Amino acid sequence: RVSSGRDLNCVPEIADTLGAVAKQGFDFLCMPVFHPRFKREFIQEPAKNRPGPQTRSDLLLSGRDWNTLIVGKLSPWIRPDSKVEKIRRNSEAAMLQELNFGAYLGLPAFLLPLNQEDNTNLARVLTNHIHTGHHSSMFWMRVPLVAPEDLRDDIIENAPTTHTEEYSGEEKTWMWWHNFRTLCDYSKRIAVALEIGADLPSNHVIDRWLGEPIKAAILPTSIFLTNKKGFPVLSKMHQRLIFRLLKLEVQFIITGTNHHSEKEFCSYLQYLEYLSQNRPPPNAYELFAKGYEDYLQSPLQPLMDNLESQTYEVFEKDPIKYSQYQQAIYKCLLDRVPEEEKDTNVQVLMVLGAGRGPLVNASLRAAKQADRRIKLYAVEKNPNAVVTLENWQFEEWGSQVTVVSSDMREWVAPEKADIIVSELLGSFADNELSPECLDGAQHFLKDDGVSIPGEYTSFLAPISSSKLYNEVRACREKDRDPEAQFEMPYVVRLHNFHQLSAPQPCFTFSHPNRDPMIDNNRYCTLEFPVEVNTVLHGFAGYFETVLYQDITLSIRPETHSPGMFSWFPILFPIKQPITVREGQTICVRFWRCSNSKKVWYEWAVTAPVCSAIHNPTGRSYTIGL
Amino acid sequence: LPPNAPACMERQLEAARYRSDGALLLGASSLSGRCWAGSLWLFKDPCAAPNEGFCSAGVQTEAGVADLTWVGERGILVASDSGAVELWELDENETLIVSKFCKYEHDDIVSTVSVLSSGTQAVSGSKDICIKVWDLAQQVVLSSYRAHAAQVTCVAASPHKDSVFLSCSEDNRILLWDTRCPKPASQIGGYLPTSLAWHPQQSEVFVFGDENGTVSLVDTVLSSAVHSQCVTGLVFSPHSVPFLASLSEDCSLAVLDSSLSELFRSQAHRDFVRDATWSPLNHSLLTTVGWDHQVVHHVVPT
Ligand SMILES: Cn1ncc(-c2cc([C@H]3CCCO3)c3c(=O)[nH]nc(CN)c3c2)c1-c1sc2ccccc2c1C#N
Ligand SMILES: CSC[C@H]1O[C@@H](n2cnc3c(N)ncnc32)[C@H](O)[C@@H]1O
Numbered sequence: 001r002v003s004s005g006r007d008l009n010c011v012p013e014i015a016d017t018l019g020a021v022a023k024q025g026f027d028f029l030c031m032p033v034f035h036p037r038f039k040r041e042f043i044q045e046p047a048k049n050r051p052g053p054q055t056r057s058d059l060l061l062s063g064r065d066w067n068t069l070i071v072g073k074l075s076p077w078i079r080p081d082s083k084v085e086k087i088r089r090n091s092e093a094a095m096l097q098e099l100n101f102g103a104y105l106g107l108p109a110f111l112l113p114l115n116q117e118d119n120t121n122l123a124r125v126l127t128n129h130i131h132t133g134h135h136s137s138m139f140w141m142r143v144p145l146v147a148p149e150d151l152r153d154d155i156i157e158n159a160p161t162t163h164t165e166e167y168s169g170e171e172k173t174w175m176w177w178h179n180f181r182t183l184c185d186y187s188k189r190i191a192v193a194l195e196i197g198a199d200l201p202s203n204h205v206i207d208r209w210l211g212e213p214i215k216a217a218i219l220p221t222s223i224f225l226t227n228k229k230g231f232p233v234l235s236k237m238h239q240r241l242i243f244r245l246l247k248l249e250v251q252f253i254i255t256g257t258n259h260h261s262e263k264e265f266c267s268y269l270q271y272l273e274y275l276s277q278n279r280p281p282p283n284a285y286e287l288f289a290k291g292y293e294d295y296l297q298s299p300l301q302p303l304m305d306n307l308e309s310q311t312y313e314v315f316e317k318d319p320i321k322y323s324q325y326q327q328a329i330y331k332c333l334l335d336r337v338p339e340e341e342k343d344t345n346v347q348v349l350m351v352l353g354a355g356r357g358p359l360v361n362a363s364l365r366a367a368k369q370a371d372r373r374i375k376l377y378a379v380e381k382n383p384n385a386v387v388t389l390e391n392w393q394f395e396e397w398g399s400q401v402t403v404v405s406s407d408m409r410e411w412v413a414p415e416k417a418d419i420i421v422s423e424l425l426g427s428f429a430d431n432e433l434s435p436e437c438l439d440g441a442q443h444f445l446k447d448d449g450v451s452i453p454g455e456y457t458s459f460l461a462p463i464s465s466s467k468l469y470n471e472v473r474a475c476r477e478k479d480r481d482p483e484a485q486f487e488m489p490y491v492v493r494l495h496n497f498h499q500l501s502a503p504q505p506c507f508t509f510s511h512p513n514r515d516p517m518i519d520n521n522r523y524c525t526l527e528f529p530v531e532v533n534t535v536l537h538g539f540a541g542y543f544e545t546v547l548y549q550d551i552t553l554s555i556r557p558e559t560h561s562p563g564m565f566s567w568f569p570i571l572f573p574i575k576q577p578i579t580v581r582e583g584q585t586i587c588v589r590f591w592r593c594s595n596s597k598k599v600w601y602e603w604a605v606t607a608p609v610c611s612a613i614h615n616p617t618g619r620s621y622t623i624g625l
Numbered sequence: 626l627p628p629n630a631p632a633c634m635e636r637q638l639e640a641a642r643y644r645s646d647g648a649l650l651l652g653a654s655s656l657s658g659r660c661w662a663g664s665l666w667l668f669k670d671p672c673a674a675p676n677e678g679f680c681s682a683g684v685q686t687e688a689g690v691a692d693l694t695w696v697g698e699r700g701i702l703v704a705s706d707s708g709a710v711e712l713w714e715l716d717e718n719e720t721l722i723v724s725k726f727c728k729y730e731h732d733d734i735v736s737t738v739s740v741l742s743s744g745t746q747a748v749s750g751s752k753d754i755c756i757k758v759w760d761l762a763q764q765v766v767l768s769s770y771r772a773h774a775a776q777v778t779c780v781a782a783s784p785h786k787d788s789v790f791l792s793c794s795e796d797n798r799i800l801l802w803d804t805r806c807p808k809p810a811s812q813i814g815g816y817l818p819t820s821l822a823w824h825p826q827q828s829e830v831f832v833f834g835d836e837n838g839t840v841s842l843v844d845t846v847l848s849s850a851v852h853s854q855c856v857t858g859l860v861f862s863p864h865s866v867p868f869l870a871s872l873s874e875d876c877s878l879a880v881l882d883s884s885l886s887e888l889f890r891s892q893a894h895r896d897f898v899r900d901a902t903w904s905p906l907n908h909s910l911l912t913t914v915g916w917d918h919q920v921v922h923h924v925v926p927t
Contacts, residue, residue, distance in 0.1 A: 009733055009734055009752075010661075010688050010689075010705075010706040010707045011661060012661050012662050012687060013659065013660055013661070035656040035689075036734060037656060037689065037706070037734065038637075038657060039897070041874070044853070046876055046896070047874065047876055047895075047896055049895075050896055050916075052657070053657055053658060054657060055657055056657075056658070060659065083816070084816065084836055084837055086853075086854065087836065115775075147774070148754055148774040149774040149796070151771075152754075152772060152774055153771045154808075155770060155771075155809055155810050156772055156800065156810040156811065156812055157806060157807075157808035157809075157810065157811050158811055220732060221732070222732060256708075256733075257708045257709075257729040258729060261729070
């Protein structure tokens, strides 16, 4: 199931054309709203007084058809950046006319070309149109992967084509788009329609378009190969790009006439549907996270807040996570109780933050497969979840489990524990104050006691994603700092983004913390070697943790626990994007700050440029103690 | 009202070309309204044009007519909006206009077309940036060149060198072609070129107009500001010492001499002037058509 469209520059009759397009199997159509050759004068007589109609009648389609089937194309003669002044004036008026007519029709999207470097006036006219009534209509900027000048045949005798690698020159089309969308102040209505040439550029050019708002991919018929049967196919290099684009769920647009006239025209389309069915199906996790892709979420604060019922239900829907807990408890019980003492040695386990008791059941499963005796305490400060624990404790567990409705930092334990087990970790390891909670609970852990997890570590990596920067930018709220949305982290299933360097460790905590001078404040400096040209929009966060010995949990991509749904990455945005050239080092600083009431993070970029310090004094974001 | 001829002709007239005996070929297309198509017409009486009831033949096409040109005495070669290059041929009675072949080879609007010296090959330009050399007999593309980086605005075959032709594009390149060389294109040293015209009596001499209204005289430089808008076309008169007809989007026609000086000026058209053709019978009569549905017969003073 691919959402494909057909691009046309010649429509004799809309009713006849649109029917033949849909019968071939397309979902929409790109066509001009005025005749492509119908040049129009707006200033000089006698041409300005040309009698109408100026284009087709809107009655030729239903309102629903204009809303869902037609994509408008700007007329190719409209050049608002021409060096001729008379041509600029006419183009400005014609662009406003064609755009306003598209808005009159309620078209879902409108196509504008980026085929040269200077589109400044084109940007101004479009920006003016956008600030004329609030609408949802999209603008697809048609931009080629490779500029036409850089793919022309080397047939001009006295002007040979460049045969030496121009690393930045081969990225020129991305600079066209970047300068255009920056002039337009990152308008959420302006997206990219990337056009795929017959010869693909280097990999660093395709990676340039990572994290960019690509809504459509334009595939000319002239890039398709012909197999033995005579049907259009693609090269293995082009197939590799299509697979990358299907992960972005872009819409594919077929342009150009039918060169394989021996076959019908839906043959190009059937090959896309063919490539679509052949790909690795959802691998449980991708099946679960699908829908949350690039969706910003406020990071849970299970200490300050009481989590709802269906939140716990989601926590309990990850068996791989808890079987890792069960194994960690299993290995720990064997190392503490020798075989000759399996009947006399009762180990005191304390779940610290039990929720609705998945760790409690994981503990009961561990002691059984290990054949050891355990005495369980289930500590949970959320009184609503304590209701679930106590119905569980009366109906099944029995006297073996003791529920304690209390904060682990204030609870006066009747005895000391051999093992404490906790699941207080967030996407950034310690962003839920697992260090502070386990510190207060430390006093009732035995001198040789074991904490599970034993230690955890947070990771950071600079990322590029103009899409995510826009979504953060769209999180302005009425009665707070207009920039506070950039000074707070977000839990998000990162998707359309570009990782600019390998993740590096940030903060580490160990439990039990035998140190006499406990201090959970941190200050860390990181230097990320960037080997590409890009724009820095923020830093992705992950974490690793050691449950016990070799049993671990990880959402860090290179060591991700295979098959685990739990914990999306965290996103630390920055107020202003930062240009980064190839070979430059991104230097970021992070602080974990705290007082008696709150813990928070502050961060700043120091290289290649300096950013402002973000979230100073927790003014925009604090984690409640 | 000949058979298989549409009763109504499209508003926008795009081309007008005389042949040997004096019949006038008309190419029109509808650029607005419900249907966006085109038609072809033949007027053995030039003064009866553009009245559809008194023509010699006519036919409707699937799409518009961006450019056309004669192929001999009974052949009509058409550059279509549909991306195809069509060839139509009159019957022996010259009462019907039948399609000979229709090949969809360009990926965008075919904007310009021109027949080469041998009369058996033709070169076409399109907004898909391509230029194609055609075999009119085998109905196939001989060569396909992508030398420009923008829309191909105009292609003009050399009058007597069967392998030479000119092309200009919005990439601000004027290319001289010679399919005998390994690299067939060669760049000739502003404002975007929009119209080309070889000199009929001098081999290495041609003229080109730009989108700013300047006509220039170039050798393998003299120029004058003729129009106030884009120069759409340039046609030389059939005289021994020829004149230069220049039509533009300023709705005016100008006639120039050897040194690009203005001898005549017509503003009879109210919309864009799209083509001009010199009568082979009366060398002083000049016929111009435009998007105002006017077919004007000028008497140029010589
Ligand atoms: C916004 N936020 N902040 C923190 C957590 C979170 C998430 C998870 C898991 C559940 C499934 C995907 O992670 C866990 C968890 O498993 N254990 N513990 C904690 C807190 N210490 C925990 C905390 C979340 C949540 S809400 C939720 C609901 C539907 C889909 C995904 C997420 C998701 C994520 N990621
Ligand atoms: C598994 S999500 C973390 C769980 O631990 C609980 N929790 C967090 N902090 C504390 C604390 N200080 N004392 C007791 N339970 C806690 C939360 O209420 C939630 O059920």
